[PDB]
Design a protein around this ligand. Structure first.
Ligand SMILES: [Fe+3]
Length: 54
C-alpha cells in the first residue's frame, strides 16, 4: 500500500503498518484515517502529509 510523509517532521505513515498505538490497524488507507488523527511524532494535521508517489 501507500506511504505518506509528514512534511513537518519526516514521519512516514505507512498504510501497511497503520498506527496501532493510536487506534489505527494495519492496512488503513490514509484517506480512511479519522479527521482528527494527527502525526504521532509532531502533532501535525493530515493536511501536512504528502503521498509518496509521482
Ligand atoms: Fe510529523
Amino acid at each position: 500500500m501507500a506511504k505518506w510523509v509528514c512534511k513537518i517532521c519526516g514521519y512516514i505513515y505507512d498504510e501497511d503498518a497503520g498506527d496501532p498505538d493510536n487506534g489505527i490497524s494495519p492496512g488503513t488507507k490514509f484517506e480512511e484515517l479519522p479527521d482528527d488523527w494527527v502525526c504521532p511524532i509532531c502533532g501535525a494535521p493530515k493536511s501536512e502529509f504528502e503521498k509518496l508517489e509521482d
